[PDB]
Amino acid sequence: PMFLPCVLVPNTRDCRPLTYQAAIPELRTPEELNPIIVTPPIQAIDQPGILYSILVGTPEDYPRFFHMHPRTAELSLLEPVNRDFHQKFDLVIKAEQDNGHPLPAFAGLHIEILDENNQSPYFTMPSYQGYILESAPVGATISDSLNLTSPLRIVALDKDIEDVPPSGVPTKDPELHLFLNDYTSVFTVTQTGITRYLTLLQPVDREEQQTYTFSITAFDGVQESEPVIVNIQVMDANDNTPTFPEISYDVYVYTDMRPGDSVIQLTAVDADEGSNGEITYEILVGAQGDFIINKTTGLITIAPGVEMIVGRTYALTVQAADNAPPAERRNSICTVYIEVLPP
């Protein structure tokens, strides 16, 4: 006899060496899995009764685990299979005539022992602390430090795919899904690879929200990881000009006023953080000598050694500028208009 299916070797009359396939969960019992299923069904045919056996195989303890019924060719498991010790089996199945003159046939039978997807994935870190500049575009990549040079790396593994030791370099991609439980509208995460990354879906304003706290969760097709907390800091850029409440001030002074006295108290606002939002005031021109401004306070006073003459008018050009780097610094101007009355 000869095994089904027969597939001619091109340009001859031999069947192709045929190899049956089966696969089995580890640590599960004869009762549970029997009968073991074989693609394609093991069958042989004459062209009077047929006998199915196992000649040989590797490892040599194949007979500990596998018995083959000799008329049907049905395959049984005799013992649970611990994948730690046993991973595959390559057998040579035989089929012959129950005559004294057999015309026997051979096929292979590969048996794959499987790690079943009964463990939930984990992240190699207890939490994540990422950074991005409010100035970054859609598509840009969360970073691991204030330097914004390295991207934030998120590694999630599954022990049903490879048992990596707690220090260990991984080598197999567990083909997992990672999902954010919040801010799904703002951030996304690379959907493939051992290492995953974050990127913006939508730009972010430090002056709105400067921190994002959410968790990510892994999924292997069946179970999920514990959630792991990710935490994203939005770093300041100088996107806010020191603006004044008004564009013009009308201010009257009197002749009996003396040096040091208050004229007007200006106060600009710069929503930025740090020194990007720190304000410095100067009078660019118009003082004519008779007024000065507190660089820090925005309070204008009457200059030292100076007399208010009842005629005079002035137009002070006053500037507020933040203390960013000169290349990135901003400013905004208002005019204070003054006239001297008598007491």
- Is the Cβ of residue 205 or residue 261 nearer to Ca ion in the bound state? 205
What are the C-alpha distances in Å from 197 to residues 130, 144, 187, 329?
10, 10, 10, 33
Of 80, 105, 84, 103, nearest to 93 by C-alpha is: 105
Three-state secondary-structure class, residue 156: strand
Count of residues touching Ca ion (by CB under 5 A): 17
Q: Distance between CA 227 and CA 73 in Å, rounded?
A: 49
> Per-residue string for binding with Na ion, 116-145, x by CB under 5 A?
--x---------------------------
> Is 322 one of the binding residues for Na ion (CB under 5 A)?
no
The stretch near Ca ion (CB under 5 A) out of 41-49, 148-156, 266-274, 307-315 is 266-274
Least separation in angstroms between residue 92's CB and Ca ion is 34
CA-wise closest residue to 300 among 282, 315, 285: 282
Contact segment (CB under 5 A) with Na ion among 1-9, 112-120, 209-217, 254-262 equals 112-120
Contact string 257-296 vs Na ion (x = CB under 5 A): ----------------------------------------
Q: Coil, strand, or helix at residue 34?
A: coil
Considering only 3, 50, 115, 176, the residue that binds Na ion (CB under 5 A) is 115
| Closest alpha carbon to 44 in 111, 98, 110 | 98
Residue 63: strand, helix, or coil: helix
Of the ranges 77-85, 186-194, 224-232, 276-284, which one interacts with Ca ion (CB under 5 A)?
276-284
Residue 152: in which H helix or E strand, if any? none
Contact in structure between 83 and 63 (CB atoms under 8 Å): no
Stretch that binds Ca ion, among 17-25, 61-69, 249-257, 264-272 (CB under 5 A): 264-272
- Residues 156 to 215 in contact with Ca ion, rule: CB under 5 A: 158, 160, 205-207
User: Do residues 332 and 242 lie in contact, with contact meaning Cβ atoms separated by under 8 Å?
Assistant: yes
> For residue 276, what is the enclosing H or E element?
none
CB of 279 to Ca ion, least distance (A): 8
CA 261, CA 336: separation in Å to the nearest integer? 16
Contact pattern for Ca ion over residues 41 through 80, marking x by CB under 5 A: ----------------------------------------
Chain residues 222-241 in contact with Ca ion, contact rule CB under 5 A: 236, 238-240
158 binds Na ion (CB under 5 A): no
Distances from the Cα of 199 to the Cαs of 121, 194, 207, 236, in angstroms?
23, 17, 20, 18
Report the DSSP beta bridge partners of residue 318: 283, 334
115 touches Ca ion by CB under 5 A:
no
Among 234, 322, 334, 338, binds Ca ion (CB under 5 A): 322
Interface positions with Na ion (CB under 5 A): 115, 118, 160
Footprint of Ca ion on this chain (CB under 5 A)? 117, 119, 134, 158, 160, 205-207, 220, 236, 238-240, 270, 272, 276, 322
